[PDB]
Amino acid sequence: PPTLPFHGESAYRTDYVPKPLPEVAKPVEVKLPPTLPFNAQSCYRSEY
Amino acid sequence: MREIVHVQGGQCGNQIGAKFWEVISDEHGIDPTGTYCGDSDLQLERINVFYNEATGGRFVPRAILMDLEPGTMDSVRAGPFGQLFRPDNFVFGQTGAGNNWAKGHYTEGAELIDSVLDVVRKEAEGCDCLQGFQITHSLGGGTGSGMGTLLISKVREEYPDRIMETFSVFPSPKVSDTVVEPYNATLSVHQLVENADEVQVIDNEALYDICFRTLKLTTPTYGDLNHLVSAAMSGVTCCLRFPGQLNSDLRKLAVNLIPFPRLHFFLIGFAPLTSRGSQQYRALSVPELTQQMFDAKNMMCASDPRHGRYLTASAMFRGRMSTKEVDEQMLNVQNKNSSYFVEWIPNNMKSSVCDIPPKGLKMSVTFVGNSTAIQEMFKRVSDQFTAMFRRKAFLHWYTGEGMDEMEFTEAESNMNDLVSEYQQYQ
Numbered sequence: 374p375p376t377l378p379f380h381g382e383s384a385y386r387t388d389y390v391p392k393p394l395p396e397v398a399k400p401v402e403v404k405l406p407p408t409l410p411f412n413a414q415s416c417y418r419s420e421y
Numbered sequence: 422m423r424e425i426v427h428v429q430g431g432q433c434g435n436q437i438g439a440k441f442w443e444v445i446s447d448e449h450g451i452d453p454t455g456t457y458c459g460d461s462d463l464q465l466e467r468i469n470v471f472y473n474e475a476t477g478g479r480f481v482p483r484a485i486l487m488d489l490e491p492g493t494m495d496s497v498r499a500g501p502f503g504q505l506f507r508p509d510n511f512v513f514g515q516t517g518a519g520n521n522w523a524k525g526h527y528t529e530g531a532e533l534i535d536s537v538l539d540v541v542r543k544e545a546e547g548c549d550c551l552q553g554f555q556i557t558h559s560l561g562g563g564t565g566s567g568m569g570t571l572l573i574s575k576v577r578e579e580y581p582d583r584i585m586e587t588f589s590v591f592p593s594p595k596v597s598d599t600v601v602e603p604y605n606a607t608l609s610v611h612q613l614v615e616n617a618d619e620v621q622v623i624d625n626e627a628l629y630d631i632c633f634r635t636l637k638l639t640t641p642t643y644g645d646l647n648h649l650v651s652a653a654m655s656g657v658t659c660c661l662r663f664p665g666q667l668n669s670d671l672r673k674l675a676v677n678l679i680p681f682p683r684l685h686f687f688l689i690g691f692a693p694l695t696s697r698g699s700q701q702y703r704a705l706s707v708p709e710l711t712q713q714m715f716d717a718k719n720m721m722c723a724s725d726p727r728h729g730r731y732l733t734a735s736a737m738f739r740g741r742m743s744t745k746e747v748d749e750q751m752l753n754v755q756n757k758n759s760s761y762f763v764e765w766i767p768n769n770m771k772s773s774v775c776d777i778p779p780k781g782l783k784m785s786v787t788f789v790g791n792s793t794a795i796q797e798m799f800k801r802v803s804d805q806f807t808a809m810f811r812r813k814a815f816l817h818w819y820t821g822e823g824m825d826e827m828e829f830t831e832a833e834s835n836m837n838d839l840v841s842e843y844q845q846y847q
């Protein structure tokens with residue numbers, strides 16, 4: 374008589390394989406608004 | 422000559438103030454390595470309020486980072502604009518404060534408070550005269566409510582002259598998380614009434630309310646609603662940071678908004694705000710900022726200003742504008758909407774004008790007001806507190822680590838009388 378060869382693979386042996394790592398490369402590139410150039414052009418030079 | 426020292430406590434506190442240092446940086450041209458790009462005299466002449474030198478030209482923020490976990494302070498450091506803060510000013514703590522007010526205040530936070538007080542004494546006392554402290558925390562967790570108020574108590578006795586402005590985040594209970602929100606909220610309020618000069622009440626639901634019915638966002642994230650808070654935090658200290666036609670100060674706000682020392686809980690808001698397909702549809706004038714600075718939804722606390730009265734109010738306008746309109750519009754809201762304005766103070770309005778508008782915009786304005794409708798926030802937490810309290814709810818954590826029963830009844834007393842004191846002037 375033959376031996377029924379043991380096929381069997383547990384939960385811990387089956388149901389996860391090493392996943393590919395998540396592809397993350399994205400910073401928050403913020404274009405700076407340039408400082409709005411200032412003429413609240415003062416009193417002395419403004420009127421006299 | 423005057424300095425604000427920012428201390429941020431909690432997961433909410435660290436993330437909000439990380440956006441605050443991000444928006445103060447690009448208001449000041451600071452690159453996230455400390456270098457300064459863009460040429461302007463006015464963007465560095467009053468940068469000592471929030472930054473110090475480092476004998477390498479590096480402008481370093483006055484940040485006193487705090488949370489009882491190596492958690493969100495790792496994400497603040499690893500994220501953008503995270504290299505600015507000193508690694509020394511990153512007091513960690515490894516034991517953990519699990520949303521429990523007594524953890525941060527009594528039994529785990531009392532062994533790290535002696536180090537963050539050492540840090541803030543090294544960084545704030547080492548100057549000629551500091552203007553005050555700015556504290557950012559949420560009264561919903563265990564770190565912000567527990568450790569935050571513990572430092573608030575120690576600072577007010579070491580410096581019983583300086584202004585502590587606290588951008589507290591009250592637990593908004595309509596939609597929220599953690600089951601111990603009323604316990605952490607009420608156990609902190611009966612401390613903020615005594616040893617806190619200004620408390621700006623912020624609720625998360627109102628931040629979603631702006632993010633849904635004003636900005637028309639798709640998915641309002643925590644970063645977006647932390648950006649709106651940092652708008653108000655920068656706008657209040659605008660005159661302290663830039664010149665203007667009518668300069669102000671945090672003490673000018675305190676003396677013009679606190680009729681009696683216990684009543685100092687303000688509704689904050691900020692809106693030259695608009696949706697995505699409407700900034701090219703909406704104008705920009707002083708009446709238009711005015712009508713979106715009183716109305717219903719620009720408030721960052723979930724308290725309707727129509728359900729009450731304004732004891733006193735203030736308006737921090739910013740940018741180039743005529744001084745006639747900034748006076749006439751505060752008159753116009755005063756006499757048209759007179760029911761929502763108290764009479765035993767006549768002419769309840771402060772206006773104040775910055776000359777430098779925020780980045781991109783042409784003019785902005787922030788509201789801070791002492792509306793008596795703040796009673797409906799303390800009432801909306803009291804009716805949840807007494808519900809849990811009658812059958813001795815999640816409490817063996819609080820009592821087991823060194824709180825007697827009298828502390829909880831004393832918590833109910835000083836917050837019930839706060840609502841009653843607001844009743845006498847409504």
Ligand SMILES: Nc1nc2c(ncn2[C@@H]2O[C@H](COP(=O)(O)OP(=O)(O)O)[C@@H](O)[C@H]2O)c(=O)[nH]1
Nearest residue numbers: 431432433436520559561562563564565598643
């Ligand atoms: N605005 C804002 N609120 C937050 C953030 N993180 C947590 N919260 C709120 O804070 C409450 C939890 O308290 P939290 O400060 O995170 O706990 P703590 O770290 O022990 O102080 C929850 O109700 C959250 O809604 C954040 O990044 N921004």
